[PDB]
Design a protein around this ligand. Structure first.
Ligand SMILES: COc1ccc(C(=O)Nc2ncc(-c3ccc(C(=O)O)cc3)s2)cc1
Length: 329
């Protein structure tokens, strides 16, 4: 008879108590840098709505990355910009070193610090058990910081986690989907990579929060220790939830939907079927045991939970024994 509302259990009113210019990006006035200080070197990846290039600051010969914002909606540009500024300086948060525009065209471009990212398409291998705990911990720092600042990343995935292994340097990037958290707001469930979409999104529950991001984190932790990227590999959004259900089980999935009085599509109930909750051990093998430990499994199990309200906060996660060595260090 109607979805049960929900609210973040932590940092719930973080933006409510701040000045109106902090989250009101629509009124944010941008200060422009000088476009002529940069020269594009080569195109990297791509994207819909943006063109990313490796570049060089002609003033200091320093490498930099430039994201040209293609014709879209100024609000979206204002949102990412305001967010990037609000987070500037945060631990492991990509640094927005400048903002420029074509004086004639008006086409906006975001200049970021450069990261000599180690090729991930085949790197998470040499990554030792300690390397994972370390980087996971570092990713946690960024999340707790951004969440602390009332902001949801919404696109946590391996591609948005730049890593310069040689320098043990990590950065969380592309805040293109990030949004400000305001208790009781209904958000767009169509964010984040499919393999990293949380149950809440998959069942169309819109009143979600920061917890979306630890689920995505949990997915990354899984793929990393079990050496299966992506861990949950669905064909489409519907199948994505089936992949999760085959691991976490259907009973818990149904208690969750029941709890929030969520209505699922009829056909969806047919494809979910019936599955038992499998034990994580079931996924460990000779090629990934060195990365798996009891602590890792306990931590992962506390991240990957249907009910977003029951997931660990980034802060609580940084306290898990899995990180004993890292912290100690
Ligand atoms: C193989 O060596 C490599 C060295 C460097 C790179 C590379 O892309 N470096 C990069 N450094 C920073 C990058 C970056 C890309 C997008 C965004 C955003 O917020 O949208 C922010 C920062 S990309 C890629 C490969």
């Amino acid at each position: 008879s109607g979805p049960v509302p929900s609210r973040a259990r932590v940092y719930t009113d973080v933006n409510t108590h701040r000045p109106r210019e902090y989250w009101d990006y629509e009124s944010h006035v941008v200060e422009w840098g000088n476009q002529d200080d940069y020269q594009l070197v080569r195109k990297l990846g791509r994207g819909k709505y943006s063109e990313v290039f490796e570049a060089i600051n002609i003033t200091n010969n320093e490498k930099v990355v430039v994201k040209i914002l293609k014709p879209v909606k100024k609000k979206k540009i204002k949102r990412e910009i305001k967010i990037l500024e609000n987070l500037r300086g945060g631990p492991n948060i990509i640094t927005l070193a400048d903002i420029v525009k074509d004086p004639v065209s008006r086409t906006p471009a975001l200049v970021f610090e450069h990261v000599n990212n180690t090729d991930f398409k085949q790197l998470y291998q040499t990554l030792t058990d300690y390397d994972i705990r370390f980087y996971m911990y570092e990713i946690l720092k960024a999340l707790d910081y951004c969440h602390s600042m009332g902001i949801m990343h919404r696109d946590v995935k391996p591609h948005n986690v730049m890593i310069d292994h040689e320098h043990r340097k990590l950065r969380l990037i592309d805040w293109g989907l990030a949004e400000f958290y305001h208790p009781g707001q209904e958000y767009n469930v169509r964010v984040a990579s499919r393999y990293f979409k949380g149950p809440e999104l998959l069942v169309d529950y819109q009143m979600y929060d920061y917890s979306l991001d630890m689920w995505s984190l949990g997915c990354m932790l899984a793929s990393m220790i079990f050496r299966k990227e992506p861990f949950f590999h669905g064909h489409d959004n519907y199948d994505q939830l089936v992949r999760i259900a085959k691991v976490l089980g259907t009973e818990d999935l149904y208690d969750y939907i029941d709890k929030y009085n969520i209505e699922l599509d009829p056909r969806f109930n047919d494809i979910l079927g019936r599955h038992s909750r499998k034990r994580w051990e079931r996924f460990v093998h000779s090629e990934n045991q060195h990365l798996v430990s009891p602590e890792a499994l306990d931590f992962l199990d506390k991240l990957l939970r249907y009910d977003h309200q029951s997931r660990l906060t980034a802060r609580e996660a940084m306290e898990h024994p899995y990180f004993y060595t890292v912290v100690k260090d």
